[PDB]
Amino acid sequence: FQEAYPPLCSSDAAMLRTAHAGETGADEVHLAQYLIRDASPLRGCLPL
C-alpha cells in the first residue's frame, strides 16, 4: 500500500501521560507542542 502507520508520539512527556492512574493523555496540541494518537494496527496491544 506504500503507507506507514503513525504510533503514539508526542513532543512533550508532560502531555503524553495524564494524572489519573490509568490511560494516557489525549490532548491534541497545547501551545506549540503536539500529540499524535495511535493510528497503527497495534491499538489494543503493546502495553504501556
Added chain:
Amino acid sequence: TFIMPMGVFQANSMDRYTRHAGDFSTVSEQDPRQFPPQGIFFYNKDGIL
C-alpha cells in the same frame, strides 16, 4: 528490594509544570514547592506514613 530517590531535582525547566493553575496554593508570596526536595514519603507495613 525497593528503590526510591530522595534529592532528585528536575534540572530541565520543561518538566517543572503543573497540571492546573491553583493545584496547591499557599499564603506565602513564594510558593514552597519550587525549592528542591530534601525528603521522600512512603508507606509503612501497617499503612503508617
